[PDB]
Write a protein that binds this DNA or RNA. Sequence first.
RNA 1: CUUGAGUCUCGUAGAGGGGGGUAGAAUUCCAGGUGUAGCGGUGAAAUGCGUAGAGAUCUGGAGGAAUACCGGUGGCGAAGGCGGCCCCCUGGACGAAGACUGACGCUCAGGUGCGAAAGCGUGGGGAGCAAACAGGAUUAGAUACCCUGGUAGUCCACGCCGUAAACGAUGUCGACUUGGAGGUUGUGCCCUUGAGGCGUGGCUUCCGGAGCUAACGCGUUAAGUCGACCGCCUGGGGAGUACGGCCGCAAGGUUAAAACUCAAAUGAAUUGACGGGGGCCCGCACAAGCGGUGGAGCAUGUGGUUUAAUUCGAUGCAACGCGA
Lengths: 95, 83
Amino acid sequence: RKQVSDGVAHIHASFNNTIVTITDRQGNALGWATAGGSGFRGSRKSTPFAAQVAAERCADAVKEYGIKNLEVMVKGPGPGRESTIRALNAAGFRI
Amino acid sequence: VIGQRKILPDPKFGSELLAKFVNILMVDGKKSTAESIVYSALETLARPVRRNALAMRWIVEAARKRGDKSMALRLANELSDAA
RNA sequence: CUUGAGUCUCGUAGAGGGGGGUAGAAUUCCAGGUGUAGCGGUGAAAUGCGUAGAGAUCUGGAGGAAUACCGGUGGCGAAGGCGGCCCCCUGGACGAAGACUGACGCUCAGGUGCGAAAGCGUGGGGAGCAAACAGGAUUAGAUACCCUGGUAGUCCACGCCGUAAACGAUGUCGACUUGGAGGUUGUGCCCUUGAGGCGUGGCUUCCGGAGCUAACGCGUUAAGUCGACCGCCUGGGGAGUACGGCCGCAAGGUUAAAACUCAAAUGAAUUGACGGGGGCCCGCACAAGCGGUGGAGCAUGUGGUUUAAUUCGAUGCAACGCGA
């Protein structure tokens, strides 16, 4: 949408589902993805696999926006904090 | 812990690096047959207890029902292919 | 009279209390954009939200609650209990010398006052939550559990309540009796460096001596040794119940029996038992390697079918090429 290769990733890390947005430095969201509902829902949620797949979903949701460095400002702790962080960093981005 | 069994060197050549080989291609306590097997394959072709043992066992273990004249000489072909 | 008690003079520490404004973190919606397949959750869905733009972002608002670090083995308070910052009013405590009074004391039935939380009443307030209640599924059926909303309440003002495992389950006051280890707060001497080294007070945490205790334990903050006064107890249950009184806005509280029934109820400690909160060690137990049985035909044995009988016993590992 902007092709600035910059912005922040507000990680809305809740217990059951961690649903991370991609908003710019100004404060407008770019593209979005979700862990729950996006392929799995249940009590067996809240797992590092869920956080990781949410990270890849949030990445691929904004891989077409010409962004290659997204910072992380996480809101609250969620299950698999290291899993989602590592998965997001593996997409080729700078915090 | 304890070390592996020490075997006297192969008397025929006085070398330790051949007795261990002839003891595993051996079957049913028939060492006498074993020389008839491998010496015909060897005299006429012209930790150290983990990877050498495992790899060389794989050579011996495929000569049971290959269906030819005799696996006594087929293993000679197999080692010839290996060498 | 001056040793108890008090008055004074000067400082110290403190979430002691009442007020008054005060600021952010978080909090939800709105105010907009940024965004479209999700938000949501359990034993599981689901119920409830959303594609009508839902969450998050920044933006400002709204408003209430409560003050993360400091923070504690801390502190203050009679107890309940007190924790953002700052001011006003205020209480008590402690230390140093000195002055003053001149037994002015201690304890207290009755009485009086304070008194968590819930609750009540009257007005407000309501950001989150949350008995009740409302959806889904429960489970042996579910009015389980749960999750989703959610009202009283929670918050403020005034009045009521007057109760708690209101506990240190330890009344108040004084005196005396070995130690060791701390913390907090004063203060004297000497290092006139800041602590320092040596005192000396007050509070306070923990070991332990004698002593005491049934034991556990307590142990100079005593459960020791004593003295003053008060409250209270008299087997368990019935029962802190009934009745009456008093009190309260009903709400309940307080005072407080008996019949009847039982031969116990109980404290502390001992042993060893489940102990689904542990470790440690050893073992062809696992790891490695070797050779195999479960497929077939016979031998034998075991259960099952028939026959007069297929004799009996063995019948998890510790019966089944067993007695034989």
